[PDB]
Ligand binder design. Structure first.
Ligand SMILES: COc1cc(-c2cccc(-c3ccc4c(c3)OCCO4)c2Cl)ccc1CN1CC[C@@H](C(=O)NCCO)C1
Ligand SMILES: [Cl-]
Ligand SMILES: [Cl-]
Lengths: 126, 126
């Protein structure tokens, strides 16, 4: 019974920091990279689309350009880790990691962003 | 390039009526029912989970119990049609049909529900 799991369903991160959001999927010893599809989104925004052992940045939402990456090292360990660099207040929301690997499933992850006045003020007027 | 498509991304339905929400996926001549995964949800509520040629009502959200069904006749024609009977105001929302069939994709469908005063009054006072 194919299941994606999340060690943490909540992340509290500081504006300006890097975060790694993780989800696990069952890998039995050896990864079948051909069959693997990893897809990250927040609300409805495409972050990552890993298919046929390669990311597809053509479909990636502009706000996550050059600052969103899948950690391919961890994929062998059944960990689809999404790193977001330079976290903004816009990154606060519900993420979804959708994985297909024989079966298919997804999990939700809530991200809260703490920001000082200055950063908040700018986001407020936007 | 595996793609789910929706003829209509918006449905306006009357309280008390039945609705059929549709998604298409490419079927090349013959359906491989073993590989097919169809999954319907509305705002994170599980409606349908079709896998290994069979629905799984164990994970189905209670509000869609006995009144939500996948049209299996149309699956061979690459049409994952979700029928909801006796539409309520609670059914208004964003639906997602997630399909895995070799590749994987999903589409969003917005449903609006028109209801008379009486039905609205009852929904208003949850
Ligand atoms: C068979 O069960 C499912 C199946 C699919 C499911 C079905 C079909 C396709 C895809 C999928 C795969 C990759 C993609 C993609 C879509 O579109 C493009 C990007 O790459 C998924 Cl994912 C989805 C869900 C479930 C069931 N889960 C288990 C409980 C519940 C859950 O975990 N909720 C979240 C809790 O935080 C729903
Ligand atoms: Cl996590
Ligand atoms: Cl439709």
């Amino acid at each position: 019974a194919f299941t994606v799991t999340v060690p943490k369903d909540l992340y509290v991160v500081e504006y300006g920091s890097n975060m790694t959001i993780e989800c696990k999927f069952p890998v039995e010893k050896q990864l079948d990279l051909a069959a693997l599809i990893v897809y990250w989104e927040m609300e409805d925004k495409n972050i990552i689309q890993f298919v046929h052992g390669e990311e597809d940045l053509k479909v990636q939402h502009s706000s996550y350009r050059q600052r969103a990456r899948l950690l391919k090292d961890q994929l062998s360990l059944g960990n689809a880790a999404l790193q977001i660099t330079d976290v903004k207040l816009q990154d606060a929301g519900v993420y979804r990691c959708m994985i297909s690997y024989g079966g298919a499933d997804y999990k939700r992850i809530t991200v809260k962003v703490n920001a000082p006045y200055a950063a908040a003020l700018e986001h407020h007027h936007h």
